[PDB]
Design a protein around this ligand. Sequence first.
Ligand SMILES: Cc1cc2nc3c(=O)[nH]c(=O)nc-3n(C[C@H](O)[C@H](O)[C@H](O)COP(=O)(O)OP(=O)(O)OC[C@H]3O[C@@H](n4cnc5c(N)ncnc54)[C@H](O)[C@@H]3O)c2cc1C
Length: 534
Amino acid sequence: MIRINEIKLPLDHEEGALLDAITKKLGIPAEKVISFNVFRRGYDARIHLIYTLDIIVEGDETALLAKFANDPHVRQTPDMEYKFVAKAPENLTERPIVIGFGPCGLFAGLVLAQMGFNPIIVERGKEVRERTKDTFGFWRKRTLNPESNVQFGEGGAGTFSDGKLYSQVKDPNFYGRKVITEFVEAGAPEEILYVSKPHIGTFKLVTMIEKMRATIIELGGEIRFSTRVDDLHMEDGQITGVTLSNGEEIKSRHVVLAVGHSARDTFEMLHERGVYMEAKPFSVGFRIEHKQSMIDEARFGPNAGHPILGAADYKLVHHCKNGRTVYSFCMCPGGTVVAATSEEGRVVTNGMSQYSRAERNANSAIVVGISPEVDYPGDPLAGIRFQRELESNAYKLGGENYDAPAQKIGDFLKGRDPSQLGDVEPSFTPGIKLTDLSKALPPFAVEAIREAIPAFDRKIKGFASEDGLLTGVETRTSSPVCIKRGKDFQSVNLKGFYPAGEGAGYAGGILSAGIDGIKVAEAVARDIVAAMEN
Ligand SMILES: Cc1cc2nc3c(=O)[nH]c(=O)nc-3n(C[C@H](O)[C@H](O)[C@H](O)COP(=O)(O)OP(=O)(O)OC[C@H]3O[C@@H](n4cnc5c(N)ncnc54)[C@H](O)[C@@H]3O)c2cc1C
């Protein structure tokens, strides 16, 4: 195929302005174009769309490329097809175990299953429809199920999200593309393959994971929901199995740990058993809300409401006198601050949107880095203890209700702790209790957020508006531990055991966690292949 890039077309171009641009650029008639894909559609945020098209032409394309050698924007389309590194030897009697069915476990298990390894996937949480019952019900009737909530269950933490797929580091093996093609293959909107800043929306995420679960089952994988791993079978730096919370055993010498960074109990057990772990730094802050219209105004203006440009977003970063860095994270256009606790007596904030991104508010976590040996002890589990501390406190300030501590921008900045709501209303649910957020984070984080928000007002007008809403505590932005593994993908002090995903400290989102899943599946495969060789 032939790749043409830097095709500029007005925002409101008619259909097949694309094809016209193919013929204009390659001097070929419509009739020679067998087909084309949109490989990338972006825009310059100052409108004009920017495409990169991959084109199948009839005849000798090799000849056509030659006549354009001197054109930088006419390349040969790279070979982006995912390569299965192996296939399961027919010898196999041992099925690899995968612990957790978030994006990371999802791809470790899908890739293992596609290579005929017949992986067993366990998930402490539930199938996504019952999970949705448990979670929406927590949000409404304040009854929390510690095993089945925003953190735990089918699809892991990705499920109740805006489903943004973030930029990644370099990826010559096209892991990224492999993840998204599977998404699309399972019903995700085709758009996500080429659009800039793609998003899937929580509802689409739900139908998607189901299909993908069916796809792994059909392939010979096994998926056991409401099934929690509570201990590992260890013997001389070698794992040979796992024990379930029900007391059942499963024996295997290949075990992927992809449990997310909320698997605190699991983290405790791993410590108790001597698996190696290091304190990892991370961020904490508050969910902030403004009217989504005030963001549309600051980013677009008249072109606001356009069905392509979508709901506006933003991305902000401030270096405070404090020495700390405040930034915005998981920004959710027209979305909902969500109640993300997985623990009794703890309040946790995060963010979510629907595909349509049509709620009244724009939100995002405004967070600031904290570090082991600066902000808490340096023992491996100390970040966790510090989180639980932050979460217990917010529950408390929130009225032991599962309501969330909240304060208007205006008085948090100023210290006028008491004031009551303006027009920006809380999306957090069960609900919120106005209070003094100064009490909610460490003195240096509050000071940094305090400095950062007006500095943000300068970047987007209204960001420091008095009525804007600050909610809850966002405490779980990345893992407080590194379950270090090294080039082997194996725990540095335990063979057969594969630390993976966000939980391990090796991913930071849906796409990257999925990418890690693939890499891990590939290394479990290779290892098994090398083992089965003779
Ligand atoms: C509300 C919210 C919104 C988000 N929005 C976005 C977004 O727009 N874009 C983005 O890229 N990311 C988003 N994320 C982040 C994201 O979902 C994670 O980074 C990603 O899911 C990590 O995948 P993972 O498989 O490594 O871990 P997880 O997603 O956390 O999956 C871990 C699974 O393992 C299970 N588990 C834990 N312990 C055990 C055990 N002992 N036995 C069996 N199972 C166990 C858990 O229940 C869980 O289901 C969001 C997260 C949240 C909470």
